Design a protein around this motif. Structure first.
Motif, PDB file in Angstrom:
ATOM      1  N   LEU A 189       0.875  -1.123   0.000  1.00  0.00           N
ATOM      2  CA  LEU A 189       0.000   0.000   0.000  1.00  0.00           C
ATOM      3  C   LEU A 189       0.914   1.174   0.000  1.00  0.00           C
ATOM      4  O   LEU A 189       1.788   1.296   0.821  1.00  0.00           O
ATOM      5  N   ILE A 190       0.766   1.970  -0.920  1.00  0.00           N
ATOM      6  CA  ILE A 190       1.660   3.000  -1.128  1.00  0.00           C
ATOM      7  C   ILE A 190       0.874   4.248  -1.420  1.00  0.00           C
ATOM      8  O   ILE A 190      -0.131   4.161  -2.069  1.00  0.00           O
ATOM      9  N   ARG A 191       1.295   5.397  -0.917  1.00  0.00           N
ATOM     10  CA  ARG A 191       0.480   6.606  -1.071  1.00  0.00           C
ATOM     11  C   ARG A 191       1.312   7.817  -1.317  1.00  0.00           C
ATOM     12  O   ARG A 191       2.471   7.844  -0.981  1.00  0.00           O
ATOM     13  N   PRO A 210      -3.316   6.570  -2.170  1.00  0.00           N
ATOM     14  CA  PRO A 210      -2.580   5.435  -2.588  1.00  0.00           C
ATOM     15  C   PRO A 210      -2.263   5.443  -4.106  1.00  0.00           C
ATOM     16  O   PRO A 210      -3.170   5.421  -4.953  1.00  0.00           O
ATOM     17  N   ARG A 265       3.581   0.426   4.370  1.00  0.00           N
ATOM     18  CA  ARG A 265       3.154   1.313   3.326  1.00  0.00           C
ATOM     19  C   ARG A 265       4.204   2.346   3.126  1.00  0.00           C
ATOM     20  O   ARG A 265       5.165   2.354   3.843  1.00  0.00           O
TER      21      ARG A 265
END
Ligand code: ZN
Length: 75
Positions: free
Chosen positions: A24-26, A33, A55
């Motif tokens: 999960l990257i934002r 995300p 994340r």
């Protein structure tokens, strides 16, 4: 491994053993995300982002460009 620090995204696949495509990257300013699209900014163009446990926080297109206008809710 993991810790909070900034790394070249392009290398993040070794990092968590769970790659961007799984992590999960934002956005950093958005907290939105980022999908493989904005992840590839950090991979292809190898833009350095920050690494967080589970994340992270990077810069989507809008933010990777318009970094001068730093807002978290963009209004
Ligand atoms: Zn953004």
């Amino acid at each position: 491994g993991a810790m909070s620090y900034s790394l070249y995204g392009t290398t993040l696949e070794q990092q968590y053993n769970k790659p961007l495509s799984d992590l999960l990257i934002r956005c950093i300013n958005c907290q939105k995300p980022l999908s493989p699209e904005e992840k590839q900014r950090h991979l292809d163009k190898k833009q350095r982002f920050h690494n967080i446990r589970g994340r992270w926080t990077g810069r989507c297109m809008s933010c990777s460009r318009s970094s001068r206008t730093r807002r978290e809710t963009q209004l």
